[PDB]
Paper text:
The Aurora B chromosomal passenger complex (CPC) is a conserved regulator of mitosis. Aurora B localization and activation throughout mitosis and cytokinesis depend on three other proteins: INCENP, survivin, and borealin. Together, these proteins form the tetrameric chromosomal passenger complex (CPC). [name] actively promotes the movement of the CPC from chromatin to the central spindle at the onset of anaphase.
When expressed in cells, this traps the CPC, followed using Aurora B, at an early step of the transport cycle at the boundary between chromatin and central spindle microtubules. Progressive deletion of the C terminus of [name] showed that once amino acids C-terminal to position 650 are removed, Aurora B is released from this mutant [name] trap. This maps the putative interaction site to a region between amino acids 650 and 750. Further fine truncation mapping defines a region close to amino acid 640–660 that is necessary to trap the CPC. Mutation or deletion of these three elements showed that only the first acidic patch of amino acids 636–652 was essential for interaction of the CPC with [name] in anaphase. The minimal binding region of MKLP2557-668 exists in two species with molecular masses of 25.4 and 63.7 kD (yellow traces), consistent with a dimeric and a higher order oligomeric species. When mixed, CPI80 and MKLP2557-668 form a single species with a molecular mass of 100.3 kD (blue traces), consistent with two copies of CPI80 bound to a dimer of [name]. This proposal agrees with the dimeric structure of the core [name]-binding region, and dimeric structure for most known kinesin proteins.
Residue numbers in the entry:
A (entry chain B): 601 to 662
B (entry chain A): 594 to 664
């Protein structure tokens, strides 16, 4: 009985700390990619705004 | 003596399991990383594509509007 539960306690602690180490890695990746992609999304949103305004004008043009 | 040996045997037995867990956890992280890269890419690609297609549609609505204004 006691071997399993003595080791398993160090196994629990190791897993918790390694899961934290890896979760930070995953977050750094998640944040870096999303900042890159939100920049690309923003550049496109600004072009959509420009084109929309031009359209406002062309319809009002006649 | 043998009491020391029983202790060293228990310690090594556990050490080997901690090593195996360490390697298994890294594989689980690699898979979770793969899933996350794939989810984030696929999501932002769809968003980029959708916006690219709006730019093209707006460009064709603009040309149409200007054709009707000239006419």
């Amino acid at each position: 009985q006691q071997r399993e539960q003595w080791c398993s306690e160090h196994l629990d602690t190791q897993k918790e700390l390694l899961e934290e180490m890896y979760e930070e890695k995953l977050n750094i990746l998640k944040e870096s990619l999303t900042s890159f992609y939100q920049e690309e999304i923003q550049e496109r949103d600004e072009k959509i705004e420009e084109l929309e305004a031009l359209l406002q004008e062309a319809r009002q043009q006649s």
